[PDB]
Amino acid sequence: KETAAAKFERQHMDSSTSAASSSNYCNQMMKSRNLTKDRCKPVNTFVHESLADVQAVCSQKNVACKNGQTNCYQSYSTMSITDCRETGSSKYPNCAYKTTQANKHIIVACEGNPYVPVHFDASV
């Protein structure tokens, strides 16, 4: 099936745009990446940097993950991100989102050989 690394790219990477494309960005992207198929995923973050720069985070600042595991890493620089958050009106199958752009440090969990991002933990 889909590898964990491929799943991270599908759920979290959008290098095509530099910021939140428009007020409709999250509605379009949550659907097109298949994040509304079985339910409305309540929150998700997209990162607008190159794949190379996000993979490099696995050699940056080691920090504890929210779940207590020790394989999380925080970026030294800020990155361009978009947060998608489920609105009040939203009801499956018609999921609806608010789009918010920010520049923040990202925290990701890394695994494997090669050692690559597999989950998005937080932004700070």
Side-chain angles (χ1 to χ4, degrees), residues 2-17 19-20 22-30 32-60 62-88 90-124:
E2 202 179 26
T3 68
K7 189 171 178 165
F8 180 93
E9 298 193 31
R10 178 171 58 83
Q11 294 203 111
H12 301 297
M13 291 300 300
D14 181 20
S15 317
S16 299
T17 63
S22 67
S23 58
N24 252 312
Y25 177 85
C26 290
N27 290 333
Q28 304 174 334
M29 290 292 286
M30 291 296 284
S32 62
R33 299 299 184 81
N34 278 281
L35 306 173
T36 61
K37 183 173 198 154
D38 303 344
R39 66 168 186 139
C40 309
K41 184 174 190 193
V43 289
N44 193 62
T45 302
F46 291 99
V47 183
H48 313 299
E49 299 292 344
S50 70
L51 185 60
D53 286 353
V54 174
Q55 289 173 336
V57 179
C58 297
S59 71
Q60 298 179 22
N62 185 220
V63 299
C65 305
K66 285 175 169 169
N67 71 4
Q69 303 186 216
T70 56
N71 64 310
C72 283
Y73 300 83
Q74 179 175 314
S75 67
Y76 292 123
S77 63
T78 56
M79 293 185 172
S80 174
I81 68 173
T82 300
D83 287 324
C84 301
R85 207 145 89 99
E86 213 193 349
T87 72
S90 177
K91 279 198 185 301
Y92 183 88
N94 297 113
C95 308
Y97 296 89
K98 192 175 178 183
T99 295
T100 304
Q101 170 69 30
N103 293 84
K104 298 202 175 185
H105 302 270
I106 70 169
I107 299 174
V108 297
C110 301
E111 290 180 340
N113 173 34
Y115 200 59
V116 290
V118 294
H119 302 288
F120 190 94
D121 206 50
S123 60
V124 299

